[model samples]
Target: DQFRAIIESPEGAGHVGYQYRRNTGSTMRMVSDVLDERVSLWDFHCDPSGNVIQPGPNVDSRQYLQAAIDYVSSNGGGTITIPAGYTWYLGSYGVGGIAGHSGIIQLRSNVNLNIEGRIHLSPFFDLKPFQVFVGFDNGDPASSGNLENCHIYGHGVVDFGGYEFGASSQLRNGVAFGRSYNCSVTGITFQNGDVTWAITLGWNGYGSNCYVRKCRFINLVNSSVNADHSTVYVNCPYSGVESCYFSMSSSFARNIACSVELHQHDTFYRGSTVNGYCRGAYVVMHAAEAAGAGSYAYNMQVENNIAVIYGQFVILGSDVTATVSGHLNDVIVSGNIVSIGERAAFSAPFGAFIDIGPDNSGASNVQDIQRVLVTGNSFYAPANITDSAAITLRANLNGCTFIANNFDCRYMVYNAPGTTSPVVQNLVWDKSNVIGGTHANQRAGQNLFDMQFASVVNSTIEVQLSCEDLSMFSCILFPASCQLSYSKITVDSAWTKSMSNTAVFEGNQQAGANVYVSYPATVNLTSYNTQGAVPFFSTDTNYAWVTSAYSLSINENLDFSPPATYTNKANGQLVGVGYNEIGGVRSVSVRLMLQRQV
Candidate 1:
């Protein structure tokens, strides 16, 4: 209680990564020894006059930067403060060929990299693979003890010379951190990265509880920030991105991908906004692959954000090479609004509010996708929205629930029909959704009512349809236009309660060998037949009277036994002439003899 109060209090309140220590409230006020403890960049080889302005003729400051980081790490890791309002120009790919002499600053455990100044980083030649401006790392398996507990928080600007790099290179990142725990990057502004992604949170085996809050990622070509690369990834569990902004300019325009591509478990992305026409999903949950490892992308929540892009609000996809046993499970997307831009020029027809798939050209060998909820979102598109569906669902999706969503377009849910393997199954779209001024699937209320059906996996199994709630008037009207297709689902039994209209079997049906029906209400049957030789039986033995509410036809032979009193309106029957009925003509009863044939 004491520790949490100080951290959340006004006196202890500071930047995003600010920690309230017992001795010092925030690390910002605690500075190093100005003369001895503080290692300034001017002390290392550079124009100490601070006069170097252009990119040409600059020293590779990586050795000095690494030395400063090592010095801080060796002394139990305190703050490494840079002089405010100064620019240090560092050269890349200048001295070492391919091995690369560049500016790479590494921070270790318990280090506070306070950059109140600017660092201008540039690469001399193209193809500078395995190079980065700033990174945080520890052990191979990420020594769980000393791997994380690092923070880089300041108002400084780190500018990258992205225009100088070639079109494509092996090396590209403004800032990256890998295999660390409880690390954060806050209050810094990244600018100008035409080479590739501006920032990335790379893979970690036990990488848990990492946070990127209140940071700005601007003017990048590729993804502004990514959870992992294309290959060799690891699950980052319980990470979050809160109150951040991302955008790209016209000069820096080069396929800016997903503003936030999360491959972590239990991630929450909230209170972020984006603009400048980023041409990717505002937020995406993808199955990134790593060999010899299994990953599950599950329990993610994306909420309360706004974006201006043609891409959809959220996309869930699986990589082709991922293990087939992995799953994409329990993701919730809510409380977000996405206003789509001009999508006419897109290469493929891809427009949807949410798209779930076994994507990557049908090569993703994902086993299952379950328990995804999409609710409380508003999507706005043009009247001529010509994409496939407002929400595109592939056949591999199972056990998903969509409710309380509003779509202003005509197209609604599009389930990919499959005839072979991996069919769509067990999806629920409740009554809370409003699509184009009406309910989903053109139904009035409770779309696809809460009627449960059993799987017809066995050949000799029976299917029974009944309404459980006896108070409310329940009626099932399968729309005349749509055919309810079920495999081997036979009407083995049916029962109805309350006041319901008689059962009307319109389409062709195949009942199993022993089909039976019982109802307190009237039962209406017309267009159905049994496949086997056995007759369909009605076992309402209590009510011996078979009254026809409408004009009825007993297609099969039925037997009814009366009690003491014979009632009127007994329309059709065969019986012995025990009683005489006619206009008072008293005649002796004559018996007709019949013979049974075997």
Candidate 2:
């Protein structure tokens, strides 16, 4: 009954601002049977230029836009089209009013809303006094369905009054909503603003499923786009995002912020990237990590997003905590590229490509983080290495798998002062990208430092960590531990790879020498022996052991190839065994490759 009459059935030529919300209940099943179940086709188009009503001269006839909203709602909500020829200036629409008509608007299963014209909200329309422009409101609690092929844009500009005053955070919502389900927004654009957020949502309201795919965001400065930000925020349970592009108009240390945010909600995100300058300091997801002191947020998957930022902070929090006892439970990040530019010659150390965990003092539920899979990402920080990590897992981060990621700056991987069992493995530098310059501690032009320089500041040191194990592996290689506070480092060549603990052979063998080496008991030789190099020379000590093998081929008179004894073995060289001394990685096999000439 709800589907056949309200959603599946069509009415007539529609207008705007007529219906408040859409009808659910059997809508998904009914929409499934329409137009061969394509579920992506639209029925009609609403052209503001074509359907011009030219409202009466009350000096406040914002009702024309609302009339068009009603035309589509009662008429099965086909394609409310904005033809691509003209721009309409709709001066100041009400914020809390969009939700008033939520129940009246119903989108057919396969409807496409195409915007060919631009509708500019008048500058006099003070947004600081209002909330979000278009989205979910509890008064209209049932506005769920599908949103596609709609192009919503402003004048590509934003004029916020100032940063002080009752409006510490300006503007409300670009298109913020709540309690939505199975809806999609794609190919839409937003510009300009009044205050705090561009497009945002928050509330305990459950059953919201939506997707923002292939949408482009340009010039959304002086404001934030919050997915959720409220003390009353609770699990909206279902929603998602895909293939969205975000960029800024100006370069900033903390301006145009957060392209997308998922806070106090359960959402799945895929293929979304932000590459623009935030005029302000932080750019994406400002989800706070203040423990229970903030809000509860978790259950998410952030994958395949490329971000190049010119801001002090990039990501705030996808969840309140990266661990379990906190707000987040299951999280995974893969195949994302992050590029940060050179900051002020001096500033606070910037970290967090993806921030997990929170400042531990406030909440007792210490965010139980487990099973985080971070792999196949390229992180570039032009800043000195000692203050930037491609990924920084907060303290208490337990079962996180960091594998096959490329890091440019000397980064860090650290836990709380007492966290003992955080594990890092299978981390390779060059296997993924054939491009060579993006390696950690390879002595490029960038200055890299260790914790000796990072331990000074709390917030700064976290960002200066590395994907490699900084605690055990790095110390083994450098021996000379850095003692400068983490905040004190902004130079290069002061660091090494976290795998420096694994012993490697650095040598040039003599012409006819059968070279042999002993095990350091501090190197991971398992990786080398797994390949295939034979041992020829052997020795054993109570502390360390040794093995040797090699072959020589000199001139006919004195060829080192046809050596007397160890010559015929695999090149007459033998790589012994060793362990990572600093962290005590034990009993690894090292291989020695040699050639014999007869």
Best by lDDT: 1
Q: After superposition, how far is residue 328 of candidate 1 from its true place, in Å?
A: 1.7
Worst lDDT window (10 residues) for model 1? 589-598
Residues 87-177 of candidate 1 have per-residue lDDT tens digits of 6555643222213213255657767777788766645533353345334333233332334777777888767655444424344665555
Q: What is the per-residue lDDT of model 2 for residues 1-598, given as tens digits with 9 covering 90 to 100? A: 7544544334311211222145443343333234322211122222345443432222232344445445554545544554444454444545443535321122232234455455455444443334423444334444443233222322222222222113544334444444434445566665554334444433333435556666666654433332222111122445666786766644431333555555433565567667554311111122342222234444556678777664322232322434332344455566777776655522433444544434425331244444445577777766453445544444333344445666664343332223322222221122232222333344332222222111122111111223333333332111122221111111111222223332222121112123222112212122122222322232222112123332221213211111122322244333333222133222322222222121
Please give the clash total of every predicted structure, in order.
Answer: 0, 104
Off by over 4 Å in 1: 1-40, 43-59, 93-103, 123-146, 164-171, 202-205, 222-235, 250-256, 276-294, 319-324, 345-349, 359-361, 364-367, 415-422, 437-598
TM-scores for all predictions: 0.60, 0.54
- Which residue pairs collide, candidate 1? none
Error of 1 at 10 (Å): 40
The prediction achieving the highest TM-score against the true structure is 1
